[PDB]
Design an enzyme around this catalytic site. Structure first.
Site, mmCIF file in Angstrom:
data_model
loop_
_atom_site.group_PDB
_atom_site.id
_atom_site.type_symbol
_atom_site.label_atom_id
_atom_site.label_comp_id
_atom_site.label_asym_id
_atom_site.label_seq_id
_atom_site.Cartn_x
_atom_site.Cartn_y
_atom_site.Cartn_z
ATOM 1 N N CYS A 12 0.829 -1.168 0.000
ATOM 2 C CA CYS A 12 0.000 0.000 0.000
ATOM 3 C C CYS A 12 0.884 1.246 0.000
ATOM 4 O O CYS A 12 2.113 1.159 0.095
ATOM 5 C CB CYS A 12 -0.877 -0.010 1.245
ATOM 6 S SG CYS A 12 0.104 -0.110 2.738
ATOM 7 N N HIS A 41 5.002 -4.878 9.294
ATOM 8 C CA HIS A 41 5.009 -6.253 9.843
ATOM 9 C C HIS A 41 5.362 -7.293 8.785
ATOM 10 O O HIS A 41 4.535 -8.127 8.398
ATOM 11 C CB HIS A 41 3.660 -6.622 10.478
ATOM 12 C CG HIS A 41 3.368 -5.907 11.753
ATOM 13 N ND1 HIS A 41 2.083 -5.596 12.148
ATOM 14 C CD2 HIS A 41 4.184 -5.422 12.713
ATOM 15 C CE1 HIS A 41 2.122 -4.964 13.302
ATOM 16 N NE2 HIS A 41 3.383 -4.845 13.668
ATOM 17 N N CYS A 96 1.686 6.223 8.695
ATOM 18 C CA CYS A 96 0.913 6.494 7.527
ATOM 19 C C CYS A 96 0.004 7.680 7.828
ATOM 20 O O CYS A 96 -0.565 7.752 8.899
ATOM 21 C CB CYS A 96 0.082 5.292 7.152
ATOM 22 S SG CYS A 96 -0.846 5.515 5.636
ATOM 23 N N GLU A 126 -0.825 -0.332 16.463
ATOM 24 C CA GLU A 126 -1.675 0.739 15.934
ATOM 25 C C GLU A 126 -2.784 1.140 16.922
ATOM 26 O O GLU A 126 -3.141 2.324 17.028
ATOM 27 C CB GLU A 126 -2.286 0.352 14.595
ATOM 28 C CG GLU A 126 -2.898 1.541 13.869
ATOM 29 C CD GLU A 126 -4.072 1.177 12.982
ATOM 30 O OE1 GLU A 126 -4.071 0.089 12.355
ATOM 31 O OE2 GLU A 126 -4.999 1.997 12.903
ATOM 32 N N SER A 226 -1.610 -8.003 10.805
ATOM 33 C CA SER A 226 -3.039 -8.008 11.063
ATOM 34 C C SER A 226 -3.839 -8.027 9.761
ATOM 35 O O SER A 226 -4.734 -8.859 9.585
ATOM 36 C CB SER A 226 -3.416 -6.777 11.896
ATOM 37 O OG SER A 226 -4.789 -6.767 12.213
HETATM 38 C C1 LIG Z 1 1.084 0.241 8.744
HETATM 39 C C2 LIG Z 1 -0.081 -0.694 8.916
HETATM 40 C C3 LIG Z 1 -0.316 -1.952 8.096
HETATM 41 C C4 LIG Z 1 0.611 -2.494 7.020
HETATM 42 O O1 LIG Z 1 0.735 -3.863 7.347
HETATM 43 P P1 LIG Z 1 1.411 -4.298 8.585
HETATM 44 O O2 LIG Z 1 1.313 -5.747 8.393
HETATM 45 O O3 LIG Z 1 2.680 -3.647 8.698
HETATM 46 O O4 LIG Z 1 0.526 -3.836 9.835
HETATM 47 P P2 LIG Z 1 -0.780 -4.504 10.419
HETATM 48 O O5 LIG Z 1 -1.443 -4.997 9.306
HETATM 49 O O6 LIG Z 1 -1.359 -3.398 11.073
HETATM 50 O O7 LIG Z 1 -0.233 -5.448 11.312
HETATM 51 C C5 LIG Z 1 -1.081 -0.423 9.997
HETATM 52 S S1 LIG Z 1 -1.759 1.153 9.520
HETATM 53 S S1 SF4 Z 2 -3.284 2.698 6.827
HETATM 54 FE FE1 SF4 Z 2 -1.840 1.093 7.167
HETATM 55 S S2 SF4 Z 2 -2.591 -0.192 5.659
HETATM 56 FE FE2 SF4 Z 2 -3.750 1.515 5.095
HETATM 57 S S3 SF4 Z 2 -2.317 2.499 3.763
HETATM 58 FE FE3 SF4 Z 2 -1.655 3.336 5.563
HETATM 59 S S4 SF4 Z 2 -0.162 1.831 6.039
HETATM 60 FE FE4 SF4 Z 2 -1.121 0.818 4.428
#
Ligand SMILES: C/C(=C\COP(=O)(O)OP(=O)(O)O)CS
Ligand code: SF4
EC number: 1.17.7.4
Length: 309
Positions: A12, A41, A96, A126, A226
């Site tokens: 993302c 993660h 983010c 988070e 997650s």
């Molecule tokens: C940065 C975020 C998600 C991107 O994936 P991730 O696996 O690093 O984090 P979670 O999915 O929150 O565990 C939480 S906004």
């Molecule tokens: S909120 Fe977390 S998951 Fe959605 S864009 Fe920002 S980083 Fe990627």
């Protein structure tokens, strides 16, 4: 065996920005670069950055005076931010923007002594970052994970009550929690739907389309991701065998042995290289050319701070 790829999948805008932040900081300040929590993660991303001189820590106290410190994309509590500020550190913030936006609304409700409710998973960084934006003890901040949690919650003033959510939740489960919140607290206010980000929404939708076609779904993502867990969970609820895997090495032959159609996706923290290697493994097990499904085209990009180029 047909190999299908979900669309969208993988990085993302938030994750791509956060990684580039650590990479660029390493490139301009050299090693070491301190990062509070895994930047995203993903085991491959983290081990790679660690091999390049990033030092991942849970607390500010283990960071030495004069060092460069980066907050992970998941965000940090106000207590963490101020402890970091109070120390002799140079601080870069990789949270983010879509997390920050939720933080600012929580901060608003705190300043007003007006209670807020967060839908999220206990212990997740988070959630800790988001809960940690509230501090006015005249009000309150409560975590709910389920309708049952809602059904037990008592608050001080139901007439001035608002809700927020984690950005990486199940769209379906969160709808059930919000339904419960509005039945119990008819005056509760929130956004039009929730704070689940475009990426989470899109990847769950894409895994939905994927598992309508595929008999087995492989989700590339680490165990502590997650949003990646939500993808695997989603496919499993649709009655498909689904596995969360870090790399092609995790694939067991029994999973796909007599499967005509296998789907592959990736969470928001998983690099594309892991998927190509997964696909490569499936092809060793009789898979053909990977067919990407048609999907919603994402167009959002978050730039690194100017200071980091
Ligand atoms: C940065 C975020 C998600 C991107 O994936 P991730 O696996 O690093 O984090 P979670 O999915 O929150 O565990 C939480 S906004
Ligand atoms: S909120 Fe977390 S998951 Fe959605 S864009 Fe920002 S980083 Fe990627």
């Amino acid at each position: 065996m047909q190999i299908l790829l979900a669309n969208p999948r993988g990085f993302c805008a938030g994750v791509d920005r956060a990684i580039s932040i650590v990479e660029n900081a390493l490139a301009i300040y050299g090693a070491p670069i301190y990062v509070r929590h895994e930047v995203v993660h993903n085991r491959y991303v983290v081990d790679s950055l660690r091999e390049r001189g990033a030092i991942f820590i849970e607390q500010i106290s283990e960071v030495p005076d004069g060092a460069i410190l980066i907050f992970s994309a998941h965000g940090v509590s106000q207590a963490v931010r101020n402890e970091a500020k109070s120390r002799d550190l140079t601080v870069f913030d990789a949270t983010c923007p879509l997390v920050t936006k939720v933080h600012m609304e929580v901060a608003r409700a705190s300043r007003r002594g007006e209670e807020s409710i967060l839908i999220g998973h206990a212990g997740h960084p988070e959630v800790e970052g988001t809960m940690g934006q509230y501090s006015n003890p005249e009000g309150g901040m409560y975590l709910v994970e389920s309708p049952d949690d809602v059904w037990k919650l008592t608050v001080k003033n139901e007439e001035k009550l608002s809700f927020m959510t984690q950005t990486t939740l199940s769209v379906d489960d969160t709808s059930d929690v919000i339904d419960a919140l509005r039945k119990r607290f008819p005056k509760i206010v929130g956004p039009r739907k929730d704070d689940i980000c475009y990426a989470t929404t899109n990847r769950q939708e894409a895994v939905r389309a994927l598992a309508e076609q595929a008999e087995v779904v492989l989700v590339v993502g680490s165990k502590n991701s997650s949003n990646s867990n939500r993808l695997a969970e989603l496919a499993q609820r649709m009655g498909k065998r689904a596995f969360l895997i870090d790399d092609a090495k995790d694939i067991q032959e029994e999973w796909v042995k007599e499967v005509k159609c296998v789907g592959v996706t990736a969470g928001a923290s998983a690099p594309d290289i892991l998927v190509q290697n997964v696909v490569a493994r499936l092809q060793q097990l009789g898979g053909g050319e990977a067919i990407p499904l048609e999907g919603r085209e994402e167009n959002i990009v978050f730039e690194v701070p100017k200071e980091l180029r």
